[PDB]
Nucleic acid binder design. Structure first.
Ligand code: NI
Length: 288
DNA sequence: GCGCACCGAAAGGTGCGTATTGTCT
């Protein structure tokens, strides 16, 4: 699954909290992109530099970016592309404990982002005429997480693409995100294909469903739903309001997701894993 | 965006809208 969300000023607090969330059996933060190579960024994401970049401060001595933003409009700080694995894949990786599956997810994400980068663009005006240039470079902060809001195993990565890109003439500008945003479904299929390929190299058999999504063949739907509490909460909201999931409006969909949410409280990380294992036995899951 | 108005200073730049599957911010 792949979803996008344009980030604005009001989201600056959430964007930097991508450090606190998830889970810790684990390089869970990493830089990516030619634009990042350009600025001298590699390895772990330094939280201090990340905040400055979100604010439009490339550092080194040039001016704060994006001053051309209209005061009656919102300032954009980035674009979050969130990659999520199928439930069974999260289970095998975080409950049974297969570290090679974590790597399979990371590779799939990295390869998809390379194709999103090929779609990076910027604008440039010369004597009144505006032109769109395919830029090819991005600055990305990647944060891997391990739990859902209800604390079920949920392997995912928040790829935060910063609102900046370097043109042919050497000038840094805001990202024209059209091609990346409109290619979300296509990029989601790239992630699915690469993940599948990496899992098959490890020896797993896959079961394709109907949307073109897949789950490991040895884990069934009943067992999957037993580790999908949020999905259960969303389904109850629709039922209570008497709505048909096949035809709900966007407003109703967002309402079901947002309003059925409970508050995020912390957990004892070592104890949670043991709970998962006992729950898995209860559901009759054989990880063999 | 389906070329605009309004940002700051460059006969220059930006938001805006874009999206829509499930494991579910
Ligand atoms: Ni997360």
């Amino acid at each position: 699954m792949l979803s996008h969300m344009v980030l604005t000023r009001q989201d600056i607090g959430r964007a930097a909290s991508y450090y606190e969330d998830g889970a810790d059996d684990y390089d869970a933060s990493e830089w990516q992109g030619k634009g990042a190579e350009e600025l001298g960024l590699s390895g772990e994401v330094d939280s201090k530099r990340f905040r400055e970049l979100l604010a439009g401060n490339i550092g080194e001595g040039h001016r704060i970016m994006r001053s051309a933003t209209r005061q009656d409009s919102k300032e954009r700080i980035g674009l979050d592309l969130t990659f999520s694995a199928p439930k069974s894949v999260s289970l095998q990786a975080l409950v049974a404990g297969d570290a090679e599956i974590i790597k399979a997810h990371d590779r799939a994400v990295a390869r998809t982002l390379e194709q999103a980068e090929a779609r990076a663009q910027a604008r440039q005006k010369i004597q009144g005429k505006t032109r769109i240039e395919t830029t090819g470079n991005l600055v990305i902060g990647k944060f891997r997480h391990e739990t859902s809001r209800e604390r079920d195993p949920q392997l995912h990565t928040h790829a935060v693409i910063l609102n900046m890109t370097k043109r042919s003439d050497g000038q840094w500008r805001a990202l024209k995100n059209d091609e990346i945003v409109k290619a979300t479904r296509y990029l989601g299929a790239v992630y699915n294909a690469e993940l599948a390929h990496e899992l098959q190299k490890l020896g797993y058999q896959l079961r394709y469903g109907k949307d073109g999504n897949f789950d490991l063949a040895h884990i069934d739907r009943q067992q999957i739903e037993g580790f999908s509490k949020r999905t259960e909460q969303i389904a109850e909201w629709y039922a209570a309001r008497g709505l048909d999931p096949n035809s709900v409006s966007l407003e109703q969909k967002q309402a079901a997701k947002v309003l059925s949410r409970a508050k995020k409280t912390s957990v004892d990380r070592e104890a949670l894993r043991a709970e998962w294992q006992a729950t898995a036995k209860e559901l009759g899951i054989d990880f063999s």
